[PDB]
Amino acid sequence: AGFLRRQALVLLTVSGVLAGAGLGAALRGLSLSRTQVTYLAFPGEMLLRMLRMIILPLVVCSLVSGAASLDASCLGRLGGIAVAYFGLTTLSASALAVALAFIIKPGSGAPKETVDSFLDLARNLFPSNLVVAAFRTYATDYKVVTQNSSSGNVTHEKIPIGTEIEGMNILGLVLFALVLGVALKKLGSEGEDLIRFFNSLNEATMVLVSWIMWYVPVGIMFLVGSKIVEMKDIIVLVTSLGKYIFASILGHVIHGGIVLPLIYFVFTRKNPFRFLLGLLAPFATAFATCSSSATLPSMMKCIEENNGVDKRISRFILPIGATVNMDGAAIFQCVAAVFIAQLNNVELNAGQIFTILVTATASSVGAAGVPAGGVLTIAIILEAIGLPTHDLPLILAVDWIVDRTTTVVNVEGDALGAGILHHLNQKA
Amino acid sequence: AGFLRRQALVLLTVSGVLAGAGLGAALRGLSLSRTQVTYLAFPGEMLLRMLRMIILPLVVCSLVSGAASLDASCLGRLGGIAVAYFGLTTLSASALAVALAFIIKPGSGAPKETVDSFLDLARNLFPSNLVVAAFRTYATDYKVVTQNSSSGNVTHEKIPIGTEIEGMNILGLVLFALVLGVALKKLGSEGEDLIRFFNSLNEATMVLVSWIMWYVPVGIMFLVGSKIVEMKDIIVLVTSLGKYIFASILGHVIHGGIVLPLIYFVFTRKNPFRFLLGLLAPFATAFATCSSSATLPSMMKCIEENNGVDKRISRFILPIGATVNMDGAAIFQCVAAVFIAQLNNVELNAGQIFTILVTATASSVGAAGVPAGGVLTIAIILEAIGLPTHDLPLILAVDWIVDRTTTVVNVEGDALGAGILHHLNQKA
Amino acid sequence: AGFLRRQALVLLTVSGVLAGAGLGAALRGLSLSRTQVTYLAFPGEMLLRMLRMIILPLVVCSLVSGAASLDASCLGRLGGIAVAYFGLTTLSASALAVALAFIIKPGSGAPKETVDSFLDLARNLFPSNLVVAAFRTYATDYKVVTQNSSSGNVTHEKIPIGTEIEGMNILGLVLFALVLGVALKKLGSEGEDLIRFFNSLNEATMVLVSWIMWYVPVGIMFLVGSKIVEMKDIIVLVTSLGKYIFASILGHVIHGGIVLPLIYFVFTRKNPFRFLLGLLAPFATAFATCSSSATLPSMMKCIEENNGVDKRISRFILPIGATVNMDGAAIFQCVAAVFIAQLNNVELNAGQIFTILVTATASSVGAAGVPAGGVLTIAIILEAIGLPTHDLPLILAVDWIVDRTTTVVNVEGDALGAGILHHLNQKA
């Protein structure tokens, strides 16, 4: 009876998804034309609608509230170096992840724009007014006027003129939110009350999505089967999913075992092998716990005597960096976004490669600690490009492994960051 | 001199409307083409514009503020039964009122959609984002694609696809407002300040409409005559109005004398005739006072000794239920909405029958106590369907009788509700 | 070194603009087709975008905050007369300025609507809902229906019907803001907290535009040269600018030396020449200081003994009137608006003459004290008509003279106002 209320929600979700698979496992189609099929997937559209419900208030409130507490008077003049280090390592992680994913091409088994579109991004960086930036944005298009064709430019003008196209710009909002966030804090405590306003609304708006969770197991079984009845193919999906998982885990391992150890060796001038020999058991328990936040004291408990670390920094910046610095998570969103991009065969559009990368890096200050918290990060970045999020569930049916894959590298990242900062402090 | 400032506003309004009627009572038309007529009704459009001014802030603020104070810790575990009773009796009242009005058909003397449109309502129940839901909503339409016509579906596809059509969705907003209202109260006193915010704005936004009242007598005389000059018929209007009033009063009497006494007899097992014999004078003074709130102490003063009632409940829930539970008012809005619907010959559209009914039931927590407070309820429900509200004045030129008709049944409703709750408590 | 940080920003701006002029002073065009020219003016469009960024929050917050502190309990029953005097003198100033500018016609050297469009303004005075009034408004158009052409109205109906056209209505918002501002103050201190909200946001939103100033010198040099390369004419621009400056200074002098002295003589019945003979040095130092706020004590220090003034009013209303009452500033915005209107050859449209005048008068309660504070006033009134603000810089390259021209008359205005109020108080 006690175990009934411990982890019931996950059991209900997995039972629902397997029941939906079994219902799709009926005889082949038993279906009429699209008239019957379309209205049999109604709750899935309903679930996506309720997920799109709160994309705006969360991104507009929680980001500002988080930016309000940032830059704590710069009490550590050498602390901003750590912030830049976190930013650059997240950037490099995202870049290598997307490059490797494009190299392996997972999910690809089964009117043009010139390269001068970058300025359009810069134009979408700053909306004309806030209200317009909520549903539609700016985009250029080339048309021929035959104005210079009269003399020497026959049959081709390529005159660029910008029009309005639906879809909001989360990119066009995050910078304004950050500017406002630093603004209402810089002037002093006289505008302090506004912070006490905003830092409430997030707590007021997050709770409701938990109730949305209570509906998730019901909806999923409706659209998973609704996806498999008409495909009639099972090998393609499982092969694509396996390739995606293999690519993601390979990227995580390659990042964790390579990128930061070189930087550590650059300034340590010693053996990184000696570092982790006394840390084998904390690493194992972090791998097993599936939640790096729970095993936080283990890192300090071991490295306090195993490694020549300081006492202040060991208990000063690590709690802060364990929530803001997420490493494998960004890899997860990147490999998921490119995965759906390859399923939908949309485009390469390096201009969009920059925007997805920057959104992934900027959203690394969002949900953390709780397992599978990056689903909202995936949703918002998918909304930033306007792709149908109806393929979302198939990514968290296997998250119970990518969680172990990502938490260990996420904690190792800021662990070695604290170590290299300790070494820097040893150099005075 | 003292009587000059007592009830001057009503005298000014009635003098203005009769003066406008007299100005329309000039020789038959004395009019040029529509060019002259259209710009001679300008202030009426101005009055409607100023009424549409504050439809959004009131409905978005007062509803949330009211929902914040709801569910007072459920201190009476048997109290929610009374809330359900009020909801069901209001629902039954609205249903019987609209059914009887459709039976009698008042005002009817002088591209098609299939029955599967209900889901569209459900789709409008949840907007994609709040900003879009302020001016336009979703609606499906059938078009032919001739995709299956190549084989066996010739000349007909009936493919449904949804488009955007102007007009907001008050239905698509009230549920979100209620959810937010329960949300900012459930988490605790830490978000309490937000309530102290909202419960201010209503008091800040209601006062101004009183100033709007100061303009009402001026505007009405402009458009009443502007309505009667071109019709040239007087019998139709008066006959329709008389039929409407007769239907409304018959519905009120039928509800009051029938629907609740049966429920009372079900659980009382005694004579309802003995109940009201000692209450004849309080009923008469409630009928004469035209304001049930003023005669509130009379109910308790009589039933304290005339009927075997309890002492706690007699002074505990009645003040609360005298403001939220309105009975004849809902009948009034229903019979008015169907009346303008029959004048305009729009449609039956049972799907709209559900939405008008649910809006009427949900708005029963709005303005109360003050006479003729339901005019805003009529306005908002008319806006919910997008009908021209230019026919509003003719409904409150006779409200001085429907007020007496409705207040007596409104007070008798929760009076007998308190009585049946007392009987339930007698059964322990 | 100390002088480096005193007035560095103005030096940087002027150096940037002269460098941009020198870069445009290269050999004649050295240019390819419009394809190259258009993308070489990108930062100018960027600067205009960042200026349009904060037009809405400032106008919606600062105006309400200012209106909240207005009408300080009417402690001086004769004080509202001064408010009406300020309003009427600003109105007369704007009227004479625009009339003289239209007479001189500066900058003019190098589908129709009937006169019944005034009601359209009144229709735009009150928007249907706040959200729609943020990007598009109402405007009528005449079309032919040939409905009465069948009998006697052949070939012409002129039926007016209103459609929606992009562009917001600042006029359609300021009155609502003022009404809300008086509303949340009239009900009492219970809604006081809301004021403490609004009067914060302005202080939160003004600071950021200072940072925008830090970018102004960089951007200007890009589009000034981009304006002069393709014109190839220098005489027209300098002649137009000189004519504009001469007209503005003539209008300022004519107003200051004429309009108010007559009113003073009407109620003083004495010699105005005797008034300013002892004030010659304060006037000179006000002319030299370029900032009337700095020389505020000089006025009272001289007129305390030179003129028979009272003691209370001399230090009671003058600090308040030195910030709200701006005189030459309104002349400046009027002559600038008409100047760009004549450059663009748009229209006369007396209906727009009323709206520009009323916006200029209402915005006279905005930025004051700081030199060249009226640039935002020019920007908002230009946005009210939807004209391209790309010609903004050329107006503040010479403001270093109009500042002296306008501050002296601005201070003389309320100085003589205080004098005439003192004379009125002498009459009891």
Side-chain angles (χ1 to χ4, degrees):
Chain A
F3 187 78
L4 275 195
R5 293 302 194 86
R6 286 174 192 170
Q7 292 196 350
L9 74 164
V10 186
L11 180 137
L12 298 165
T13 60
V14 298
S15 56
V17 67
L18 64 90
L23 266 295
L27 199 151
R28 186 173 294 168
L30 277 71
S31 75
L32 191 146
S33 89
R34 289 184 178 179
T35 61
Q36 279 199 353
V37 179
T38 48
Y39 87 97
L40 277 177
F42 189 43
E45 178 192 12
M46 271 285 158
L47 187 44
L48 302 159
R49 208 160 194 87
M50 294 182 286
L51 276 174
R52 180 179 273 96
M53 190 36 79
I54 50 174
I55 55 171
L56 188 144
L58 196 149
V59 76
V60 76
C61 202
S62 61
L63 188 153
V64 166
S65 182
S69 44
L70 188 152
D71 199 272
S73 75
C74 298
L75 74 164
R77 188 51 48 88
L78 305 160
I81 299 169
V83 179
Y85 180 76
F86 298 148
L88 66 89
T89 186
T90 45
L91 185 64
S92 65
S94 76
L96 64 91
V98 63
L100 266 63
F102 188 85
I103 279 168
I104 308 167
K105 322 155 192 173
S108 43
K112 61 100 175 179
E113 188 80 26
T114 68
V115 296
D116 208 56
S117 76
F118 286 94
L119 61 84
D120 304 316
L121 188 148
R123 182 160 319 163
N124 278 340
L125 199 46
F126 292 92
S128 277
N129 50 309
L130 314 179
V131 185
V132 166
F135 55 91
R136 89 195 179 205
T137 67
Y138 193 100
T140 44
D141 64 84
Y142 310 98
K143 71 165 166 53
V144 63
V145 184
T146 76
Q147 54 194 2
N148 280 353
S149 305
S150 59
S151 43
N153 209 356
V154 293
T155 74
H156 184 74
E157 291 290 334
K158 198 179 286 293
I159 293 316
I161 293 175
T163 46
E164 312 300 326
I165 297 89
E166 291 310 315
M168 71 225 78
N169 48 3
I170 300 95
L171 185 151
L173 211 56
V174 288
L175 74 164
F176 167 75
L178 285 165
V179 169
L180 181 48
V182 309
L184 77 164
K185 199 265 191 177
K186 189 167 185 284
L187 77 163
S189 68
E190 297 83 346
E192 191 276 326
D193 294 331
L194 300 168
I195 295 91
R196 200 169 59 244
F197 169 85
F198 277 120
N199 59 24
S200 84
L201 266 190
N202 54 6
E203 305 156 341
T205 192
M206 81 76 68
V207 57
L208 61 89
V209 66
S210 59
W211 302 349
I212 305 306
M213 301 315 258
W214 280 92
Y215 181 77
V216 177
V218 177
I220 54 181
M221 61 79 71
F222 272 99
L223 73 163
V224 63
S226 299
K227 185 184 296 185
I228 63 181
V229 167
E230 70 278 35
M231 294 298 102
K232 321 151 182 184
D233 303 336
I234 192 162
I235 305 167
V236 176
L237 264 70
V238 299
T239 46
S240 61
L241 262 59
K243 196 201 284 192
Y244 157 84
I245 299 155
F246 286 150
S248 46
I249 62 155
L250 259 66
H252 296 114
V253 170
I254 284 167
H255 180 97
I258 304 178
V259 302
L260 72 165
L262 316 178
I263 317 163
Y264 163 85
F265 182 77
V266 158
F267 302 101
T268 312
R269 283 85 159 76
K270 273 179 299 302
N271 201 354
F273 280 90
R274 297 285 105 181
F275 184 85
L276 73 165
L277 292 174
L279 321 172
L280 82 168
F283 285 141
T285 193
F287 195 91
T289 190
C290 300
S291 178
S292 66
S293 66
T295 46
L296 177 57
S298 56
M299 295 298 102
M300 64 184 73
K301 282 158 182 202
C302 50
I303 78 163
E304 210 164 11
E305 65 270 36
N306 296 1
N307 288 129
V309 308
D310 294 331
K311 184 52 190 183
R312 327 184 165 190
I313 304 99
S314 62
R315 265 79 182 275
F316 193 71
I317 68 162
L318 277 188
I320 319 173
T323 307
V324 179
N325 175 213
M326 64 183 73
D327 303 317
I331 313 301
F332 179 53
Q333 291 90 21
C334 277
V335 302
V338 65
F339 184 58
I340 296 89
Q342 296 209 10
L343 273 295
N344 289 350
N345 316 314
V346 181
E347 69 204 301
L348 166 67
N349 187 357
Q352 277 177 345
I353 298 312
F354 287 100
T355 187
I356 188 60
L357 176 138
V358 68
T359 56
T361 58
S363 44
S364 57
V365 302
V370 289
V375 296
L376 297 203
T377 311
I378 304 151
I380 58 186
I381 67 173
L382 265 293
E383 196 79 25
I385 323 297
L387 269 297
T389 318
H390 67 301
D391 290 330
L392 182 136
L394 60 86
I395 81 167
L396 73 164
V398 75
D399 55 349
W400 55 283
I401 304 186
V402 310
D403 198 29
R404 319 186 177 251
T405 308
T406 48
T407 54
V408 61
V409 297
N410 198 356
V411 64
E412 198 273 331
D414 63 358
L416 198 53
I420 194 52
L421 270 295
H422 287 111
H423 296 305
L424 185 145
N425 310 321
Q426 291 173 328
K427 293 171 182 178
Chain B
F3 187 78
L4 275 195
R5 293 302 194 86
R6 286 174 192 170
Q7 292 196 350
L9 74 164
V10 186
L11 180 137
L12 298 165
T13 60
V14 298
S15 56
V17 67
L18 64 90
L23 266 295
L27 199 151
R28 186 173 294 168
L30 277 71
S31 75
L32 191 146
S33 89
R34 289 184 178 179
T35 61
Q36 279 199 353
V37 179
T38 48
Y39 87 97
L40 277 177
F42 189 43
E45 178 192 12
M46 271 285 158
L47 187 44
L48 302 159
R49 208 160 194 87
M50 294 182 286
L51 276 174
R52 180 179 273 96
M53 190 36 79
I54 50 174
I55 55 171
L56 188 144
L58 195 149
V59 76
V60 76
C61 202
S62 61
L63 188 153
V64 166
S65 182
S69 44
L70 188 152
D71 199 272
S73 75
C74 298
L75 74 164
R77 188 51 48 88
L78 305 160
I81 299 169
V83 179
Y85 180 76
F86 298 148
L88 66 89
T89 186
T90 45
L91 185 64
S92 65
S94 76
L96 64 91
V98 63
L100 266 63
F102 188 85
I103 279 168
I104 308 167
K105 322 155 192 173
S108 43
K112 61 100 175 179
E113 188 80 26
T114 68
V115 296
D116 208 56
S117 75
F118 286 94
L119 61 84
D120 304 316
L121 188 148
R123 182 160 319 163
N124 278 340
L125 199 46
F126 292 92
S128 277
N129 50 309
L130 314 179
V131 185
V132 166
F135 55 91
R136 89 195 179 205
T137 67
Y138 193 100
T140 44
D141 64 84
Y142 310 98
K143 71 165 166 53
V144 63
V145 184
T146 76
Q147 54 194 2
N148 280 353
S149 305
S150 59
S151 43
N153 209 356
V154 293
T155 74
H156 183 74
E157 291 290 334
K158 198 179 286 293
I159 293 316
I161 293 175
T163 46
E164 312 300 326
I165 297 89
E166 291 310 315
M168 71 225 78
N169 48 3
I170 300 95
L171 185 151
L173 211 56
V174 288
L175 74 164
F176 167 75
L178 285 164
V179 169
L180 181 48
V182 309
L184 77 164
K185 199 265 191 177
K186 189 167 185 284
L187 77 164
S189 68
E190 297 83 346
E192 191 276 326
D193 294 331
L194 300 168
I195 295 91
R196 200 169 59 244
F197 169 85
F198 277 120
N199 59 24
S200 84
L201 266 190
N202 54 5
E203 305 156 341
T205 191
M206 81 76 68
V207 57
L208 60 89
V209 66
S210 59
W211 302 349
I212 305 306
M213 301 315 258
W214 280 92
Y215 181 77
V216 177
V218 177
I220 54 181
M221 61 79 71
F222 272 99
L223 73 163
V224 63
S226 299
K227 185 184 296 185
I228 63 181
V229 167
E230 70 278 35
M231 294 298 102
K232 321 151 182 184
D233 303 336
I234 192 162
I235 305 167
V236 176
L237 264 70
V238 299
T239 46
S240 61
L241 262 59
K243 196 201 284 192
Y244 157 84
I245 299 155
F246 286 150
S248 46
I249 62 155
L250 259 66
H252 296 114
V253 170
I254 284 167
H255 180 97
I258 304 178
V259 301
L260 72 165
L262 316 178
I263 317 163
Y264 163 85
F265 182 77
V266 158
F267 302 101
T268 312
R269 283 85 159 76
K270 273 179 299 302
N271 201 354
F273 280 90
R274 297 285 105 181
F275 184 86
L276 73 165
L277 292 174
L279 321 172
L280 82 168
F283 285 141
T285 193
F287 195 91
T289 190
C290 300
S291 178
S292 66
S293 66
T295 46
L296 177 57
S298 56
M299 295 298 102
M300 64 184 73
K301 282 158 182 202
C302 50
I303 78 163
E304 210 164 11
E305 65 270 36
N306 296 1
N307 288 129
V309 308
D310 294 331
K311 184 52 190 183
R312 327 184 165 190
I313 304 99
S314 62
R315 265 79 182 275
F316 193 71
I317 68 162
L318 277 188
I320 319 173
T323 307
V324 179
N325 175 213
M326 64 183 73
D327 303 317
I331 313 301
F332 179 53
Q333 291 90 21
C334 276
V335 302
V338 65
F339 184 58
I340 296 89
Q342 296 209 10
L343 273 295
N344 289 350
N345 317 314
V346 181
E347 69 204 301
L348 166 67
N349 187 357
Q352 277 177 345
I353 298 312
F354 287 100
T355 187
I356 188 60
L357 176 138
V358 68
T359 56
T361 58
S363 44
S364 57
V365 302
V370 289
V375 296
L376 297 203
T377 311
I378 304 151
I380 58 186
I381 67 173
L382 265 293
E383 197 79 25
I385 323 297
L387 269 298
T389 318
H390 67 301
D391 290 330
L392 182 136
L394 60 86
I395 81 167
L396 73 164
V398 75
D399 55 349
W400 55 283
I401 304 186
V402 310
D403 198 29
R404 319 186 176 251
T405 308
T406 48
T407 54
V408 61
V409 297
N410 198 356
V411 64
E412 198 273 332
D414 63 358
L416 198 54
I420 193 52
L421 270 294
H422 287 111
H423 296 305
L424 185 145
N425 310 321
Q426 291 173 328
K427 293 171 182 178
Chain C
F3 187 78
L4 275 195
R5 293 302 194 86
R6 286 174 192 170
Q7 292 196 350
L9 74 164
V10 186
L11 180 137
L12 298 165
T13 60
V14 298
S15 56
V17 67
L18 64 90
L23 266 295
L27 199 151
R28 186 173 294 168
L30 277 71
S31 75
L32 191 146
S33 89
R34 289 184 178 179
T35 61
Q36 279 199 353
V37 179
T38 48
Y39 87 97
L40 277 177
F42 189 43
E45 178 192 12
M46 271 285 158
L47 187 44
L48 302 159
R49 208 160 194 87
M50 294 182 286
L51 276 174
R52 180 179 273 96
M53 190 36 79
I54 50 174
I55 55 171
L56 188 144
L58 196 149
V59 76
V60 76
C61 202
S62 61
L63 188 153
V64 166
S65 182
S69 44
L70 188 152
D71 199 272
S73 75
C74 298
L75 74 164
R77 188 51 48 88
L78 305 160
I81 299 169
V83 179
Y85 180 76
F86 298 148
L88 66 89
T89 186
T90 45
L91 185 64
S92 65
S94 76
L96 64 91
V98 63
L100 266 63
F102 188 85
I103 279 168
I104 308 167
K105 322 155 192 173
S108 43
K112 61 100 175 179
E113 188 80 26
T114 68
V115 296
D116 208 56
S117 75
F118 286 94
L119 61 84
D120 304 316
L121 189 148
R123 183 160 319 163
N124 278 340
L125 199 46
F126 292 92
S128 277
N129 50 309
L130 314 179
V131 185
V132 166
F135 55 91
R136 89 195 179 205
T137 67
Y138 193 100
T140 44
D141 64 84
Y142 310 98
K143 71 165 166 53
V144 63
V145 184
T146 76
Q147 54 194 2
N148 280 353
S149 305
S150 59
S151 43
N153 209 356
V154 293
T155 74
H156 184 74
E157 291 290 334
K158 198 179 286 293
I159 293 316
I161 293 175
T163 46
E164 312 300 326
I165 297 89
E166 291 310 315
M168 71 225 78
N169 48 3
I170 300 95
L171 185 151
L173 211 56
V174 288
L175 74 164
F176 167 75
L178 285 165
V179 169
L180 181 48
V182 309
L184 77 164
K185 199 265 191 177
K186 189 167 185 284
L187 77 164
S189 68
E190 297 83 346
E192 191 276 326
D193 294 331
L194 300 168
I195 295 91
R196 200 169 59 244
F197 169 85
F198 277 120
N199 59 24
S200 84
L201 266 190
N202 54 6
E203 305 156 341
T205 191
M206 81 76 68
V207 57
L208 60 89
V209 66
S210 59
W211 302 349
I212 305 306
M213 301 315 258
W214 280 92
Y215 181 77
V216 177
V218 177
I220 54 181
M221 61 79 71
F222 272 99
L223 73 163
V224 63
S226 299
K227 185 184 296 185
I228 63 181
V229 167
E230 70 278 35
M231 294 298 102
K232 321 151 182 184
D233 303 336
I234 192 162
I235 305 167
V236 176
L237 264 70
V238 299
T239 46
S240 61
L241 262 59
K243 196 201 284 192
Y244 157 84
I245 299 155
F246 286 150
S248 46
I249 62 155
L250 259 66
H252 296 114
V253 170
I254 284 167
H255 180 97
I258 304 178
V259 302
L260 72 165
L262 316 178
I263 317 163
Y264 163 85
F265 182 77
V266 158
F267 302 101
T268 312
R269 283 85 159 76
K270 273 179 299 303
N271 201 354
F273 280 90
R274 297 285 105 181
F275 184 86
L276 73 165
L277 292 174
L279 321 172
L280 82 168
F283 285 141
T285 193
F287 195 91
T289 190
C290 300
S291 178
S292 65
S293 66
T295 46
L296 177 57
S298 56
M299 295 299 102
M300 64 184 73
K301 282 158 182 202
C302 50
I303 78 163
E304 210 164 11
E305 65 270 36
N306 296 1
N307 288 129
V309 308
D310 294 331
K311 184 52 190 183
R312 327 184 165 190
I313 304 99
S314 62
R315 265 79 182 275
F316 193 71
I317 68 162
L318 277 188
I320 319 173
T323 307
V324 179
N325 175 213
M326 64 183 73
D327 303 317
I331 313 301
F332 179 53
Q333 291 90 21
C334 276
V335 302
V338 65
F339 184 58
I340 296 89
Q342 296 209 10
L343 273 295
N344 289 350
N345 317 314
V346 181
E347 69 204 301
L348 166 67
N349 187 357
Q352 277 177 345
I353 298 312
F354 287 101
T355 187
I356 188 60
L357 176 139
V358 68
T359 56
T361 58
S363 44
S364 57
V365 302
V370 289
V375 296
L376 297 203
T377 311
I378 304 151
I380 58 186
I381 67 173
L382 265 293
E383 197 79 25
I385 323 297
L387 269 298
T389 318
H390 67 301
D391 290 330
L392 182 136
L394 60 86
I395 81 167
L396 73 164
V398 75
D399 55 349
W400 55 283
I401 304 186
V402 310
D403 198 29
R404 319 186 176 251
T405 308
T406 48
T407 54
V408 61
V409 297
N410 198 356
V411 64
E412 198 273 332
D414 63 358
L416 198 54
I420 194 52
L421 270 294
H422 287 111
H423 296 305
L424 185 145
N425 310 321
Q426 291 173 328
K427 293 171 182 178

